Design a protein around this ligand. Structure first.
Ligand SMILES: Cc1cc2nc3c(=O)[nH]c(=O)nc-3n(C[C@H](O)[C@H](O)[C@H](O)COP(=O)(O)OP(=O)(O)OC[C@H]3O[C@@H](n4cnc5c(N)ncnc54)[C@H](O)[C@@H]3O)c2cc1C
Ligand SMILES: Cc1cc2nc3c(=O)[nH]c(=O)nc-3n(C[C@H](O)[C@H](O)[C@H](O)COP(=O)(O)OP(=O)(O)OC[C@H]3O[C@@H](n4cnc5c(N)ncnc54)[C@H](O)[C@@H]3O)c2cc1C
Ligand SMILES: NC(=O)c1ccc[n+]([C@@H]2O[C@H](COP(=O)([O-])OP(=O)(O)OC[C@H]3O[C@@H](n4cnc5c(N)ncnc54)[C@H](OP(=O)(O)O)[C@@H]3O)[C@@H](O)[C@H]2O)c1
Ligand SMILES: NC(=O)c1ccc[n+]([C@@H]2O[C@H](COP(=O)([O-])OP(=O)(O)OC[C@H]3O[C@@H](n4cnc5c(N)ncnc54)[C@H](OP(=O)(O)O)[C@@H]3O)[C@@H](O)[C@H]2O)c1
Lengths: 399, 399
């Protein structure tokens, strides 16, 4: 940890990192470069309460635990010179660094077939996106969502609640194909269909003509607006130009180190080891952004601290469904606690592999999620009869 | 480049690296730790001329361009401490380093279903392997090869030439599924079948009982020996224990840097960027081992030198077929020069993507391979009619 510290990106990973540096005792310079001209803010409400109620001051991140930080907002880092230890800024200035931290996140993938579209086509990543989408969302408007991931599904629910007609097109046979058990994905499709969402599976957008979208089955969908939610690409251009190892994401170890000396990376921009699968993955969760940022900062200030070691997990609020998912989506067995029903959904899934818990899902059952994450952390092998038995208290079992 | 240099592994990548360091002007200490008790040697003849003629002194690597290097042969590096800058050796000694280079290659994957086998089951990676296989290869013996990659196919040809009966089982629908155009793979299967190889596609080994192997179709194959050739796994255990980013291979950039300061890696043990596909891959070719080793050494001694930048290519000698393959296995078009026939095989394949050459194959046509690799290097977009026209001289076109 050499002063001064420069962080590129001012999202959740960056804020969490700089707050931890200060909390851990580092008092040297910290400068954060953020290309969006916005007080740092959290993204999950953009698909939900913000989309619905429109108050950005309710979604700002608290920078109080990060005192004495200069935030250069509305400024883009254009390049860095890892030999000179400098960063070049879009406003003409240069910053020196002892330690450089890349926390530039990821940007939505565009749909090549809609490139020359002449109807409103947005992605949903920023406050500016959400404001723009919000302003086109009249009741009885027709919204088409492309992609079956959680963001599109979160927006789908918010739109329906407002009285918007929603169609959703996904190229695969199921929703949430990334990091969700099949049982959950099937149920989530059932729920949204019952709420009026017109689901089209195994279809792709082939193009569009004057307010209508075309599909690979040769059919059409007309809509007042398309929101594309087909995943994101790491914002790793600076790393790539400077010679760091990247592949849709900057490779880092558990200390956040890149292959370039004195340059670290964290958050959505990184490809990192998933301790459960043992494979490198770009882990794009809110918990990762915060916890990896904290872990990397902690180890920078105190090198005796361990590397980042958390197992991955996320939540997704989709209307009446409060979904929580931890670990791997499947193993050699799934245990289902409770009934899987649209009549007051509440259930828990437990994925095991050779008797060890490797994943868990709670739907409207937050009480069980915390003890399951603890059991998951230690690779617990509880009695599967007890795990199934609804009499069993998961909290107590977690001892 | 801080002295002293320690290299772990004494295979082709290591030898090529240390020879380049010396050639480039570095005169400080170099110590190489090699777990095999063998004068450093080249592996390709093990499936061919060595298997057939048995003279290991014809396959030693020339260490002459690497003067003043201490080679610790028959010694295993057990761990390294990247803070202390030391390596712990199996013989009880410790080596200090300024710069550590991991060139530990890869080891054959074992077949879990043959774990408790009670018939001879070998892999083919080392001189010791080849000697052992050689000694069980009587004419009219029955050899079963598991896996359809090039090493097994090279051995298949060598065995047939000696009068051994050969069966080969591959779990997929084709041979050489890794980095070979389908047209080549189909032809290679045709050739080996015509030479007497009993090919079984889309079958897996489920186990074995008293001299007989069992398959997932419920059938049996009896053999005097099984040689397993189902791919390799990076020897990255030391890197993993020391906290480097690894995933069946140590991630490096074009300078050979790992995520750990003063530790580099090269050769079969690395996952690196393929400039043609733009993705990270473990590139397990002879040309990579030598050329990546040379590039990393060159840049260590002279930091103004460029990073490793070669496009991947390999050859495979399979009996009457002298196969050479460069670049990607497919694009949006394949041009075929010459006829694809078992009657004196000679042909060239050219893979293009948006008019640019992205890959090439020559079978018994080495004359065309060198100009194709040059065209491939610069992303040439030659007239496809000329590329097809056999009147065309590829060498001259390469201007
Ligand atoms: C609509 C929406 C809904 C979500 N809901 C959920 C959810 O239900 N659950 C969940 O787990 N997660 C959800 N997420 C939240 C999410 O996971 C976090 O926002 C994210 O993981 C934070 O990662 P980050 O800080 O690394 O990246 P980012 O938030 O993307 O921050 C990176 C910042 O760096 C900026 N930047 C990039 N390049 C440069 C440069 N050269 N110079 C300066 N600045 C640059 C970027 O523009 C960006 O502002 C949702 C996200 C969105 C968009
Ligand atoms: C049978 C066979 C046929 C082949 N034919 C072809 C071919 O037709 N074309 C082609 O392109 N390639 C072929 N290859 C050749 C090949 O590609 C090269 O051998 C390989 O790519 C060299 O890479 P390397 O130097 O990085 O690794 P290696 O050759 O594996 O060298 C690594 C060495 O490090 C040692 N080591 C590992 N861990 C430790 C430790 N902790 N301490 C000390 N030492 C350690 C290993 O045991 C090994 O000796 C063939 C290989 C084989 C085995
Ligand atoms: N939440 C956070 O939000 C960010 C990303 O969310 P997201 O909802 O947009 O991504 P997501 O969760 O991965 O959902 C992507 C959906 O779009 C599809 N898709 C991916 N690539 C496509 C392509 N090239 N063409 C057509 N469809 C494609 C996926 O299909 P498949 O599942 O079939 O691949 C999937 O259905 C991350 O930070 C994430 O963690
Ligand atoms: N040559 C060098 O030699 C080394 C490796 O050569 P190689 O010939 O052994 O590997 P290879 O060229 O990759 O050939 C592997 C073959 O075994 C199969 N296979 C891979 N994993 C398997 C598994 N888990 N179970 C059953 N079959 C599996 C592959 O099948 P699939 O193709 O279907 O995956 C393929 O047919 C490298 O250095 C290489 O560059």
């Amino acid at each position: 940890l050499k002063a001064p510290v420069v962080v590129l990106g001012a999202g959740l990973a960056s804020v969490s990192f700089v707050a931890e540096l200060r909390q851990a005792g580092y008092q040297g310079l910290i400068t954060v470069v953020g290309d969006e001209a916005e007080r740092p803010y959290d993204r999950p409400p953009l698909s939900k309460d913000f989309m619905a109620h429109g108050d950005a001051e309710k979604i700002r991140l608290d920078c109080k635990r990060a005192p004495e930080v200069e935030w250069l907002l509305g400024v883009t880092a254009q390049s860095f010179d890892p030999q000179a230890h400098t960063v070049a800024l879009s406003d003409g200035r240069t910053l020196p660094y002892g330690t450089l931290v890349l926390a530039t996140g990821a940007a939505p993938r565009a749909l090549p077939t809609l490139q020359g579209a002449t109807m409103p086509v947005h992605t949903l990543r920023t406050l500016e996106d959400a404001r723009r989408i919000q302003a086109g969302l009249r009741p009885q408007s027709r919204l088409l969502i492309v992609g079956g991931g959680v963001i599109g599904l979160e927006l789908a629910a918010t739109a329906r609640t407002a009285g918007v007609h929603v169609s959703l097109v996904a190229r695969g046979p199921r929703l949430m194909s990334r990091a969700a058990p099949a049982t959950l994905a099937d149920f989530v499709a059932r729920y949204h269909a019952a709420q009026g969402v017109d689901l089209r599976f195994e279809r792709s957008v082939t193009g569009s003509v004057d307010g209508v979208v075309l599909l690979d089955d040769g059919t059409r969908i007309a809509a007042d607006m398309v929101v594309v939610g087909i995943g994101v690409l790491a914002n790793d251009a600076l790393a790539r130009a400077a010679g760091l190892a990247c592949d849709d994401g900057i490779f880092v170890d558990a200390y956040g180190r890149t292959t370039c000396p004195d340059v670290y990376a964290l958050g959505d921009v990184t490809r990192q080891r998933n301790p459960l699968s043992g494979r490198f993955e770009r882990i794009e969760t809110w918990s990762n952004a915060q916890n990896q940022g904290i872990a990397v900062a902690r180890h920078l200030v105190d090198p005796t601290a361990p590397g980042y070691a958390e197992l991955p997990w996320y939540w997704s609020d989709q209307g009446a469904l409060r979904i929580q998912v931890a670990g791997l989506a499947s193993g050699d067995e799934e245990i289902v606690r409770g009934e899987v029903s649209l009549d007051a959904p509440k259930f828990t899934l437990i994925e095991l592999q050779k008797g060890r818990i490797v994943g868990a899902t709670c739907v409207n059952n937050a009480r069980d999620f915390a003890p399951l994450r603890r059991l998951l952390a230690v690779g617990a092998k509880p009695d599967r009869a007890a795990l199934a038995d609804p009499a069993t208290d998961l909290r107590k079992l977690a001892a």
